Amino acid sequence: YIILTFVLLLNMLIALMGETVGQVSKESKHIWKLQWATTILDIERSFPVFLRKAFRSGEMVTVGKSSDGTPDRRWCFRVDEVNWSHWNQNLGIINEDP
């Protein structure tokens, strides 16, 4: 009885040792990321619509004239980067000023 109980303990230790840890070291990151994102969205949905509109991410940038010349006025979100490989390839078409 005692020996077999110890054997079960040892076997459980081994199974947690290799199979669980090898997978966990990668899966825990992603599961936590999913939990974080879903909590963020839940917190958003808690607030009323007008408050959500007040705390809306992104700008009110205008992109350009439409088919009839009317402005686009699309809510965008800017990200910037540093690149040293492609030099003066294309240019910023919108602000035309940093």
Binding site: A37, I40, D42, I43, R56, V61, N83, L91
Partner: protein
């Protein structure tokens, strides 16, 4: 028997008698005598399937005899009747066999370019079928990577298949192209190309309309459909697409704001990603209804991770921490109320002392918190579908535990009403479960979340 063999081997020579015979006996090739009982297949599909080196010498002769006999229309587009191939037309066979010459030759004489192949065989793999291509000739041409046939079908003098038509399911050509979309390079490579081709063509022809803004019966759109199905190759392509041509630059979703030396500031369009609870944002569908296997990778696309981080910074951290503080204070009050309970006497107790008033305030606030936990958790569980394996660890277990704790508090109230002995049996379990549940809020900190 005879005619099916003649047409099956491509034997143009052996059709000499046919034309005199049909006139002599007042018979047509579409009459029931010449068609499969099981499937209703007429001579023309039989001829197109038995293609010898891509060319069967009897299709023109069959069509000539059909018009000469008076009923071309009924002949060129005769659907199948067996439940397994319902609706399939000779045009579908011509397009599927990948012979542009016969699709042209067949549409030139009045082939319906809008007939729907909706039999059991032509259904999504999840619904008992081996190929779902959008249920339409143009969708068939686009989904099997034949750009030339699409270019011909949309633009020909006889009859043009417009790109905005929807099938029975509501899926436009773009939902159909997303449906076959896969994450292998060999697939995405042409899926994205055909998607862009069709979008630009539809925009140029019909300027006012946006093809991508047509929803199917489920209310999804090509991007929103690729979000909840697990299609990275087309999802990120749609998000990052930029059209340089000035004619149709407006249908792009990533613009270049400004530049200075090696510093390029671009800006992504979030017209659909973040809508603020008005038009079924893509982000909510991606975080709740998406495919669990590939959600981790859908959430790493260029403008989504930064968006989530920005929202966390703007209003996420303070609200979560305020929530943590409130919950901890509520449980401290619950513990204090439990500790001070006079164990001598059968309730309800007379509330006369200021300490008794404090205890009554604790008792009532406990029930308020319990009914609050019931209210918001039930709302969440009703709002979101029941999860399965690989999703329990994310959030399911915590709403389960919170429900159990709320139920325990509610039954504690009932027992406390009359039965002296009963209510103390499980009210302690209430505290135990609540302190267990306080583990929920460790997800804010990554180190504690893991």
């Amino acid at each position: 028997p005879i005619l099916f063999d003649i047409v099956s081997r491509g034997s143009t020579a052996d059709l000499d008698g046919l034309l005199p015979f049909l006139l002599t006996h007042k018979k047509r090739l579409t009459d029931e005598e010449f068609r499969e009982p099981s499937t209703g297949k007429t001579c023309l599909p039989k001829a197109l399937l038995n293609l010898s080196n891509g060319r069967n010498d009897t299709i023109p002769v069959l069509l000539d005899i059909a018009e000469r006999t008076g009923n071309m229309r009924e002949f060129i587009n005769s659907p199948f009747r067996d439940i397994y191939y319902r609706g399939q037309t000779a045009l579908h066979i011509a397009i599927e066999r990948r012979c542009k010459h016969y699709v042209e030759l067949l549409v030139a004489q009045g082939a319906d370019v809008h007939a729907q192949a909706r039999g059991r065989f032509f259904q999504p793999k999840d619904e008992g079928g081996y190929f779902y291509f959008g249920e339409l000739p143009l969708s068939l041409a686009a989904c099997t990577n034949q750009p030339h046939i699409v270019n011909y079908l949309t633009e020909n003098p006889h009859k043009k298949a417009d790109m905005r038509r929807q099938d029975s399911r509501g899926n436009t050509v773009l939902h159909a192209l997303v449906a076959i979309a896969d994450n292998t390079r060999e697939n995405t490579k042409f899926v994205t190309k055909m998607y862009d081709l069709l979008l630009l063509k539809c925009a140029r022809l019909f300027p006012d309309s946006n093809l991508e803004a047509v929803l199917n019966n489920d209310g999804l759109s090509p991007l929103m459909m690729a979000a909840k199905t697990g299609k990275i190759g087309i999802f990120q392509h749609i998000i990052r697409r930029e059209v340089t041509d000035e004619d149709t630059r407006h249908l792009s979703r990533k613009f270049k704001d400004w530049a200075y030396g090696p510093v390029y500031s671009s800006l992504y369009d979030l017209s659909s990603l973040d809508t603020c609870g008005e038009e079924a944002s893509v982000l909510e569908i991606l975080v709740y209804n998406s495919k669990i296997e590939n959600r981790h990778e859908m959430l790493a696309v260029e403008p989504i991770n930064e968006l989530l981080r920005d929202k966390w910074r703007k209003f996420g951290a303070v609200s979560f921490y305020i929530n943590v503080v409130s919950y901890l204070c509520a449980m401290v009050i619950f513990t204090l109320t439990a500790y001070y309970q006079p164990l001598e006497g059968t309730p309800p107790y007379p509330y006369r002392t200021t300490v008794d008033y404090l205890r009554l305030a604790g008792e009532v606030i406990t029930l308020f918190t319990g009914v609050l936990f019931f209210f918001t958790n039930i709302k969440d569980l009703f709002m979101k579908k029941c999860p399965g394996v690989n999703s329990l660890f994310i959030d399911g277990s915590f709403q389960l535990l919170y429900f159990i704790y709320s139920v325990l508090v509610i039954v504690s109230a009932a027992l406390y009403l009359a039965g002296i002995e009963a209510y103390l049996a499980v009210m302690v379990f209430a505290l135990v479960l609540g302190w267990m549940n306080a583990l929920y809020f460790t997800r804010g900190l990554k180190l504690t979340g893991t």
